[PDB]
Enzyme design. Sequence first.
Site, mmCIF file in Angstrom:
data_model
loop_
_atom_site.group_PDB
_atom_site.id
_atom_site.type_symbol
_atom_site.label_atom_id
_atom_site.label_comp_id
_atom_site.label_asym_id
_atom_site.label_seq_id
_atom_site.Cartn_x
_atom_site.Cartn_y
_atom_site.Cartn_z
ATOM 1 N N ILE A 173 1.132 -1.186 0.186
ATOM 2 C CA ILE A 173 -0.139 -0.088 -0.054
ATOM 3 C C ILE A 173 0.955 1.404 -0.023
ATOM 4 O O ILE A 173 1.602 1.143 0.712
ATOM 5 C CB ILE A 173 -1.048 0.409 1.250
ATOM 6 C CG1 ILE A 173 -1.470 -1.486 1.791
ATOM 7 C CG2 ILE A 173 -2.034 1.111 1.012
ATOM 8 C CD1 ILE A 173 -2.358 -1.525 2.804
ATOM 9 N N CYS A 174 0.962 2.471 -1.296
ATOM 10 C CA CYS A 174 1.254 3.633 -1.125
ATOM 11 C C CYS A 174 0.255 4.631 -0.175
ATOM 12 O O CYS A 174 -0.710 4.729 -1.106
ATOM 13 C CB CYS A 174 1.989 3.752 -2.292
ATOM 14 S SG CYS A 174 1.631 5.784 -2.699
#
Lengths: 75, 147, 377
Positions: free
Chosen positions: B84-85
């Site tokens: 996840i960014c």
Amino acid sequence: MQIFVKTLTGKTITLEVESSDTIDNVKSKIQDKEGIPPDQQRLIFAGKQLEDGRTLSDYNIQKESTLHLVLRLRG
Amino acid sequence: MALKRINRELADLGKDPPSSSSAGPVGDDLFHWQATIMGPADSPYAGGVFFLSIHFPTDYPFKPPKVNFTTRIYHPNINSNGSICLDILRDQWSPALTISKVLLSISSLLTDPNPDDPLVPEIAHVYKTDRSRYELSAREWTRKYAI
Amino acid sequence: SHMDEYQRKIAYMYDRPEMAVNDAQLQLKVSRATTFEDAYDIISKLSVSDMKKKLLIRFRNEDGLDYGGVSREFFYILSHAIFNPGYSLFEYATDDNYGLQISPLSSVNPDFRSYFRFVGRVMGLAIYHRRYLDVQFVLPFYKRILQKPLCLEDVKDVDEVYYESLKWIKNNDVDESLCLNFSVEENRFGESVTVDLIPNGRNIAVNNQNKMNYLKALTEHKLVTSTEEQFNALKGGLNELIPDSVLQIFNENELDTLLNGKRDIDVQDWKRFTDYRSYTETDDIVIWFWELLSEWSPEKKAKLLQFATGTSRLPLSGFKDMHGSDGPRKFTIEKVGHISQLPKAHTCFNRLDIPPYNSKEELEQKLTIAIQETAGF
């Protein structure tokens, strides 16, 4: 009335607005004072994010209201 | 500063949990946690359960943890590996943030996906072209994988 | 002007009577495959008088002329060998921001002092013989070599998130909810141990009247106290050849220029180790892009690299071993957006979205406009 908006950097901006003032009007005031375009402004009061096309009274914004501005992107 | 803080976070989660998202150490290793997230009811992931792995660096709380998914999801911002960014976990991190705020942010992100950061470009393109087909595919993936 | 002043300083330094080479020759033979082993076998036993003579380097079974190029290649290989994190001597400050620094775990070796004295001798030999390494340390390292005090801002080069957290603690007040106290937990070879910044430091909470001392101790322990003996040996080896009174006429940037030369970003490696999404190697927006990168100044190339990837520093082996937020993520070029929109950058994936423009002039204008707010080097 008068409201105070605190940015994500802690800067506090005082705005002379009214309960009947639209969200667009306050966003235009913020743009004039800081240069942030209204579409890029993310204002949250009482955990509710302000959205264009409505007014401050729609969010129960009252005298000496405190707002949180989060000028952030996604990604 | 890196173990007393983790113990305090676990104790706080054990007192007033959000009643939806849970977190706990895997056996006895305070720097490796497992988290369970309930699918939000206002998003096509309704009724699904997701699993996350959280690694706390030795510089905690000065450095954010590393969170990864375990169950696949038709999400623009979740790659195949589940990385996840997120801005909170890399950019807008301050020592005051606990581990419950990360879980709340992720459970909120599971309702407002971002297509402009297409971590899976096909899924973001489907979102930007056909919203109905996008949500149908998301529900199909949730039915296939989540349970 | 910076360049003229630096040249004057270099001329004055090399004109000193205590930094003059002799006329005899010192033949130094090393095998190309085992460069590190032979270099440590020979250099770490030479006398100071021997190391001040002319250096002639001849690789085994490789006879040729232009010994200058041979010596430069030898120093390049040695600098990419000894400073390689895989050798457990130095290490990157962060995976996604490649900055070399002394690894605290290097103390695990029974005698790290000999190896670090060898590293110091190598650096002193490179400076003494006008030969350039090709590593990129962090500014605190150079400030330590010159013996300058280290402050909080120096943590900006080492780790950005750590510096931001420390600055947050400095600005805002600290409550008792944050379980912070005068102790650092270090995890070496799996085992985690507690180090006290001050005596009885694990039982003292940091109130609002102590956070300044806490920040000072944290910065000192992160930048200095964790690498006392190793850096002392390294600086002893370095000052063996170059007297300190010579090094202390530069600053943290002129010394970097003196060691590693004028830093530049290679374009051939960049082209060879990039990948394209929805783009082919023979597309216009690719050939024009590579022509522009070919005919550009190093400062603007560094600015573009920082705009796209997120930092202007490269791994020790070029773009091949490039890292991102998740893991190995090579530089990527993608076709995304409309013609009017400027090129966009996703830093956590080293991704650059260049829309399908029409001509080289428009591509150059858009790309130069889109990177103005980014500062590199």
